[PDB]
Amino acid sequence: DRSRAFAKDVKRIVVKVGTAVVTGKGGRLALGRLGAICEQLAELNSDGFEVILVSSGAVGLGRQRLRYRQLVNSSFADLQKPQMELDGKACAGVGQSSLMAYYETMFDQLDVTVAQMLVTDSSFRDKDFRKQLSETVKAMLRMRVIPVFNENDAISTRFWDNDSLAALLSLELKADLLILLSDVEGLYTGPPSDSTSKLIHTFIKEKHQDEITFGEKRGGMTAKVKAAVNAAYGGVPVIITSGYAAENISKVLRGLRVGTLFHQDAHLW
Amino acid sequence: RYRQLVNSSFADLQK
Amino acid sequence: RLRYRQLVNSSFADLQK
Amino acid sequence: YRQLVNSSFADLQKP
Ligand SMILES: Nc1ncnc2c1ncn2[C@@H]1O[C@H](COP(=O)(O)OP(=O)(O)OP(=O)(O)OC(=O)CC[C@@H](N)C(=O)O)[C@@H](O)[C@@H]1O
Ligand SMILES: [Mg+2]
């Protein structure tokens, strides 16, 4: 169809993986999903694309790691006592290292180099930063590398989510497609549990904005949508699709109808 | 809870 | 390693025994 | 047993 017609001209891609995709049951890494996504990204990078990956899920992985360590270091007497909460910043600082080590190992198995770029909120207001980041990203992509962006949570003092960061980077680096990998198959007219909700294949701002009732479950579908609209009307089309399927990325890149599209040229389609 | 813990194992204190 | 696994699974009572 | 109830699991690992 005319909707998925820009896919053949796609050259630079920004892919975001949520917490519901990176970390599965028990707070541990979801090895199957992450491996499939990494294999798809390596195939894409070998086929001539510039892939940018914006990861997440460091908080949960670090929280699980610190809970084990706390259990190991504790005392039977204390195990009895309700154990206190763990600091969120400490959990993020622990989990980022493990997540990046896993990413490096998986991409080394496939012979792909990765780079870790950590940017906070205060950095995006400097005049020079928005210029130097573009040059660094371009230099990395020219050399066939996959930058792995995230929000440095250990340092940051705190709307901005990981999805807003993804939209921001899509705008700045002039990407040509933005894919949001989440748990649900895509944006629905209502909560996915209800049987009266159907998968929308095109988000027209003057038709679905008022007819969509968001539920709940860093940000639900009330913030993914905001970031998607922001990125799309800045000029970068947006695709939302489930991260469970491994082959959704390639099917999107082949022009097949997958997920919901945020495109500015949806006024007349 | 005491007897429970005395019976449980470290891994069991997990989850 | 095997020792670690054994501890991780041993019941406090067994550590007693 | 008092030692065993006040020990930390790691401690059990070290003789
Ligand atoms: N109308 C609807 N249609 C479809 N689905 C809907 C709808 N209404 C509700 N839902 C449900 O909405 C949920 C959204 O999922 P969600 O909120 O869990 O988003 P998700 O991507 O998984 O996590 P995140 O990226 O936001 O977390 C981070 O950014 C971490 C940042 C970083 N510092 C780190 O700590 O790593 C879906 O699941 C459910 O269908
Ligand atoms: Mg969110």
UniProtKB/Swiss-Prot annotation, chain A:
- Where are the stretches annotated Glutamate 5-kinase? 1-269
Quote the cellular component terms of the Gene Ontology held in the record.
chloroplast; cytoplasm; plasmodesma
Keyword annotations for this protein, in alphabetical order, are: Amino-acid biosynthesis, ATP-binding, Kinase, Multifunctional enzyme, NADP, Nucleotide-binding, Oxidoreductase, Proline biosynthesis, Transferase
State where ATP binds.
Answer: S182, D183, R218, G219, G220, M221, T222, A223, K224
| Transferase keyword on record | yes
According to UniProt, the name of this protein is: Delta-1-pyrroline-5-carboxylate synthase B
What protein family is recorded? In the N-terminal section; belongs to the glutamate 5-kinase family.
Q: Which GO terms describe its biological process?
A: embryo development ending in seed dormancy; L-proline biosynthetic process; pollen development; proline biosynthetic process
Please list the GO terms describing molecular function. Answer: ATP binding; glutamate 5-kinase activity; glutamate-5-semialdehyde dehydrogenase activity
**At which positions is substrate bound?**
S56, D153, N162
What is the annotated role of this protein in its UniProt record? Answer: P5CS plays a key role in proline biosynthesis, leading to osmoregulation in plants.
Asked if NADP is a keyword of the record, the answer is: yes
